[PDB]
């Protein structure tokens, strides 16, 4: 695998040992061959699991998720997918790694897609080797891959709202269930219904994942209600997955606004990763996968691939050259390589709106490309009446940095800034000048 100009897809089935058995063998061989190596974890939770798998090997943990005193002599670096892309975008030297290892390489967040595009372009240039570790590479069509033990697959109507009757099988179960929902708001309603029925529920989403995931180890629970973030190498001691088989799709309308379309079917890759949370113990056959819909290739036209192009257009590669998306995922967007390349000061603004502003890539791009500076929040208030953000069926209001109460009416509307109470709270703080 370790030869320059090689990209290997390590596509062993979920639970086959890619992280705990194969990765340490790859790292030992890379160190023997003096390959400057990066290992990319999708989440801080996976970063910590990797430290355990790699313990004693000379690896530099570029993450506060691990508390280890480093020698200063490591040639292997470990960081999150997002950290890799972030450092490429910033005016910081990222080593030209000889070997690029991406764990949970199916991750479809924009920074992960961009990282794959940059890495696969360096490999195509003859500059580097790469290993993408995933059971479900891009365009996989198999929702039911092999497992460590047999899975009971059942197509069944799955509730997406509170229920009073007609789903006894949900609550009649005595084991532990991981339940994939399409949104935080949908999980909140199901979680409340289960809580009312006497169940112990933990909810996981991107913003809460590290903190709340620890509760799955520290407390007894009956259900984990999770969004798609638990597709990325989250492991549970569970005997059932309930899968809505639904997700939200960010869609850019008319180059002008982003909506969260759906819920709509998941991809085959997502369905396989959701299912792959169970059947992992060869000694515990008959784990259950209850699924409530079909699969479809809903990554086609999904904003994350256009956002990945916005990131890659703003990463230096060589002179004016621009990294391509990884070939198998390159048709998911209609985009011209370089169309989103920003001049130096607008690029800095773009980066800060993502890094400090915590804005979605698309929205950060609209603001930066309009020639607005990072601290200028006038655009949060001067949109059309139809861009009014609503909070409990009334227009959201904030005090501006000038001390004026105004309706939140952003010039560019991206549904991700108000997808749930926590998102809208964060965006209100942004509009107010509080970060
Ligand atoms: C984003 C982030 O957390 C980050 C970013 C850059 C560097 C590091 N830390 C290191 O380079 N390590 C670990 C600490 O002490 C020895 C060297 C962490």
UniProtKB/Swiss-Prot annotation:
The modification N6-acetyllysine is found at residue 207. ATP binds at residues 12-19. Residues 150-329 form the Helicase C-terminal domain. It comes from Zika virus (ZIKV). The chain holds residues 1681 to 2115 of 3419 of the full protein. Displays three enzymatic activities: serine protease, NTPase and RNA helicase. NS3 serine protease, in association with NS2B, performs its autocleavage and cleaves the polyprotein at dibasic sites in the cytoplasm: C-prM, NS2A-NS2B, NS2B-NS3, NS3-NS4A, NS4A-2K and NS4B-NS5. NS3 RNA helicase binds RNA and unwinds dsRNA in the 3' to 5' direction. Leads to translation arrest when expressed ex vivo. Disrupts host centrosome organization in a CEP63-dependent manner to degrade host TBK1 and inhibits innate immune response. Inhibits the integrated stress response (ISR) in the infected cell. It comes from the Viruses. The lineage of its organism: Viruses, Riboviria, Orthornavirae, Kitrinoviricota, Flasuviricetes. This is Serine protease NS3. It is a peripheral membrane protein.
């Amino acid at each position: 695998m370790l030869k320059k100009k090689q990209l290997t897809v390590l596509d062993l089935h979920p639970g086959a040992g890619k992280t705990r058995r194969v990765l340490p063998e790859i790292v030992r061989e890379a160190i023997k061959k003096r390959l400057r190596t990066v290992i990319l974890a999708p989440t801080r939770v996976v970063a910590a699991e990797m430290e355990e798998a790699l313990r004693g090997l000379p690896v530099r943990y570029m993450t506060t998720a691990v508390n280890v005193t480093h020698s200063g002599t490591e040639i292997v670096d470990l960081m999150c997918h997002a950290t890799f892309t972030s450092r490429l975008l910033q005016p910081i030297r990222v080593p030209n790694y000889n070997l690029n290892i991406m764990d949970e390489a199916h991750f479809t967040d924009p920074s992960s897609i961009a990282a794959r595009g940059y890495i696969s372009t360096r490999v195509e240039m003859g500059e580097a080797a790469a290993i993408f570790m995933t059971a479900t590479p891009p365009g996989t069509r198999d929702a039911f891959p092999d497992s460590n033990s047999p899975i009971m697959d059942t197509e069944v109507e799955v509730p997406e709202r509170a229920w009073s009757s007609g789903f006894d099988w949900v609550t009649d179960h005595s084991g532990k269930t991981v339940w994939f929902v399409p949104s935080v708001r949908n999980g909140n309603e199901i979680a409340a219904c289960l809580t009312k029925a006497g169940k112990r529920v933990i909810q996981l989403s991107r913003k809460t994942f590290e903190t709340e995931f620890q509760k799955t180890k520290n407390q007894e629970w009956d259900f984990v209600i999770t969004t798609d973030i638990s597709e990325m190498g989250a492991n549970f001691k569970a005997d059932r997955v309930i899968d809505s088989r639904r997700c939200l799709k960010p869609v850019i309308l008319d180059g002008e606004r982003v909506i969260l379309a759906g819920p709509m079917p998941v991809t085959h890759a997502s369905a396989a990763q959701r299912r792959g949370r169970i059947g992992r113990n060869p000694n515990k056959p008959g784990d259950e996968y209850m699924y409530g819909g079909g699969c479809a290739e809903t990554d086609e036209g999904h904003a994350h691939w256009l956002e990945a192009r916005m990131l890659l257009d703003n990463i230096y590669l060589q002179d004016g050259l621009i990294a391509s998306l990884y070939r198998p995922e390159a048709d998911k967007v209609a985009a011209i390589e370089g169309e989103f390349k920003l001049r130096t000061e607008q690029r800095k603004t773009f980066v800060e709106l993502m890094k400090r502003g915590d804005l979605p890539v698309w929205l950060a791009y609209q603001v930066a490309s309009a020639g607005i500076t990072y601290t200028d929040r006038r655009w949060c208030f001067d949109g059309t009446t139809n861009n009014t953000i609503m909070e409990d069926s009334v227009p959201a209001e904030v005090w501006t940095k000038y001390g004026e109460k105004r309706v939140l009416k952003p010039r560019w509307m991206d549904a991700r800034v108000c997808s749930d109470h926590a998102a809208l709270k964060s965006f209100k703080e942004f509009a107010a000048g509080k970060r």
